[PDB]
Amino acid sequence: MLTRFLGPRYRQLARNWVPTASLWGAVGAVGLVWATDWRLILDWVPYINGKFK
Amino acid sequence: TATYAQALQSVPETQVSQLDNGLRVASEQSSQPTCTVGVWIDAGSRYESEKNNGAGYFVEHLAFKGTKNRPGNALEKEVESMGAHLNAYSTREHTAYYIKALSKDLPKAVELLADIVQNCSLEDSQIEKERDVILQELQENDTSMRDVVFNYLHATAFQGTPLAQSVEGPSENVRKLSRADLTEYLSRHYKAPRMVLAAAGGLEHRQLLDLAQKHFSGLSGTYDEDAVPTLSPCRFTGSQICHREDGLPLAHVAIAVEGPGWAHPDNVALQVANAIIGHYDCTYGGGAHLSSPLASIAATNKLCQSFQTFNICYADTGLLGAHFVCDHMSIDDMMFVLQGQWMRLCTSATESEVLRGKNLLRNALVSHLDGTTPVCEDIGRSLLTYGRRIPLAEWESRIAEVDARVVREVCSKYFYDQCPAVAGFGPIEQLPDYNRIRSGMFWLRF
């Protein structure tokens, strides 16, 4: 039933929206990291080391 | 049996000569018993000032009404007697005078065109008669909601510039243009380097050149002379004009971004894109089944009486967008669907639809250039704008190059996050606020 969305037009539409989908993924990840002050990632950002000891 | 590709090569070369004048003389030879001949001039309302505006149009009204050699109706009498047709137009950039005649009548046709273009009488009694004729044509043009919105679109998009002005000019200019104003226009503008003698049909080029040397000699051949202007560039402004008139049964809306000029290579890909959006009218076969999503939805949901895409070109600027005609309760929906299609093409043009757009352009170009008259117009206009005739094989190469990536880059350059010019005339209460039109020029998901 979802055979409908398989064909060269739909592959091209996938290719067009992929830099946008991944850039939104970048917005979400940096957004979640910022909002929770997330430890694992934010120790590794070379300014923003305002824990130190 | 020949291919499309072979057939384009078999279309014969446009021959071009230049006179000592500066007058370019150019032809496409065919088999036809008939021809179109004409003079194309780099003159129009873009060349005119506030005081001058409407002069070229006034000259158009006088051009056929007597010369020094054929006074009064004598030119009319000669054109009619040979079964010929004599016509004229003035755009913002270009004036043209042309004869449809029998090929055997090419010597007198060239003779008459030279007599019109150089030796126009402008008899004071005739100028007075034409005054009342032009004013009535203004009263007439007022009833054409299409002509009105396009004048409004130019007047708002080009604001403080000579491209803001109509061809026909304001009514006060019509009533106070003297013979001396017109003589000065003709002196400044009807100069041999700024004019092209074009022909298409059953003629040799040599014969056209000989007649050009006979009849067009000594326009400029000691003169040309001081004070010319070149065209200053015309500032585009993102703006709105709203002529609210509820007495009128249907709304007219025209919306455009800044196009590039005549010269610019990405006119071709913009036209591919415009063909994809297409045109519609309520008398088309195919409601639901039409390829264009604007056309399909406008037909299904009854959004529309008509729409059209346009790419109007001037030197170094243009008007690129769309015009539509609809019911008072349909303007908001029409705009949403129009803008969504621009946004769709900018971001996510697929390949199949681009091929359709390409094919529609290939068909449009070949269908247009069919007859002595459209080919002659194409010679005259092309030599003014491009300097060459761009052959059909070249246009083909330019169309073939366009794919989905080209459509999406080229659309983004002109449409994406750009300030449109908007003109509205009629029952336009439901016409979206400009801020909300502006917000339609980008997508938040992209």
Added chain:
Amino acid sequence: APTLTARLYSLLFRRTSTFALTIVVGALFFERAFDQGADAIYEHINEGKLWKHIKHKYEN
């Protein structure tokens, strides 16, 4: 010789994706820089806080 506003538009503001990415990267770096300054302004105004606490610690 083109403007910095023009470059900030062209590279970052045109796509809503990159526009949002600019603000979120912008907000993280701003939170650090604003808090660091606003502490240091408040600290310079006051000076009887635990500026004193050299007295009582380190003896331990």
Added chain:
Amino acid sequence: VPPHPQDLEFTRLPNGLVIASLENYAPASRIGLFIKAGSRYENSNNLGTSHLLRLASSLTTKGASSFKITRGIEAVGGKLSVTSTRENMAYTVECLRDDVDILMEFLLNVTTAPEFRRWEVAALQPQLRIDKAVALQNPQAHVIENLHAAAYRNALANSLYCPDYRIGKVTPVELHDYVQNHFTSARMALIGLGVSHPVLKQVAEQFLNIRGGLGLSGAKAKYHGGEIREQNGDSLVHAALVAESAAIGSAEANAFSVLQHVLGAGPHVKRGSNATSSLYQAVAKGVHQPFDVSAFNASYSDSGLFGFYTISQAASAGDVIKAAYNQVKTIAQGNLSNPDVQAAKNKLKAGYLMSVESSEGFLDEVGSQALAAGSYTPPSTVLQQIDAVADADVINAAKKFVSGRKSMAASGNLGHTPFIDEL
């Protein structure tokens, strides 16, 4: 140098189908199927059927769906059109050279395999109302439609547009009946531009071998005369005054065509005084207000209508008609110079040759010719036929108008528009 032109190729089949092709080595091709199926072939029981047919060309067929026709044509940037006169329907198809086969297949499916599905037929009926309303916003369309109903008892009396009472009432069976009766080999001509003659001939033998229809070319159009008068108050009076002239292809028709150009057809000059137009100058003498006049010439398989058409101010309608009628009377009485006939012959000859310049005009000319005459006549023999019209033939044609039982149609404010009677 261009290529030296190919000649037109022409074939009558034993079944009566004509095939005509030209190879002008052009980037686009044009195919027309021309059929003796115009509105004259309607009777009282089925008026407007050919209107609804003209509007039904992208509906579902046996070989292609409605959707396929629209999308497949548009994919290659093609066109499908139907042009109707009172005598003919003409199904035309344009595409680039490489795309002829898909457009041919669609053309064949529209004309020989239409399904007229009840629901697709029903959904289409409101298009009759739209198409009529758009056409009838020119006052000329209502006048010429009334003019024919006034003129004819019969068949040429039929409107091109569906009668209002019939909108919603034209049935699938009537459409099926119209195609079966009229879209047959003996009533048909296949015309191609920028396709080979063998490819057309192959199409015609394989796909256009139909007969169980009707014997040919009319009920016979009974000229009658009379008047229709439509009060409008419409600022301008539009009037048309006519008599029975000559059937197309007769030598007499050529005399009528020359007479038309003596009297004056359209304008030649943008904004001109129409100096060599006999009707215009005669009206202009005693009428100082805005007006128009033209000679009207409509020639058919078995009849013709000739006279004149006037646009004028309501109060000036009588003056304009009478001035125009008297100017024809002057020509009937013998007041016609040889220079006038020679100028009028020049306008005819140039007008015709210009009419066949485009692919569009050439194909319509070749199609109509094939239906009316069963032949192709080259431009130089059309021009020879024009030349053979003597001054006396032009006088005689004008005499037939003056003495002939009249037909009249008028729309506007009619308080000053006369009544045949009063002319």
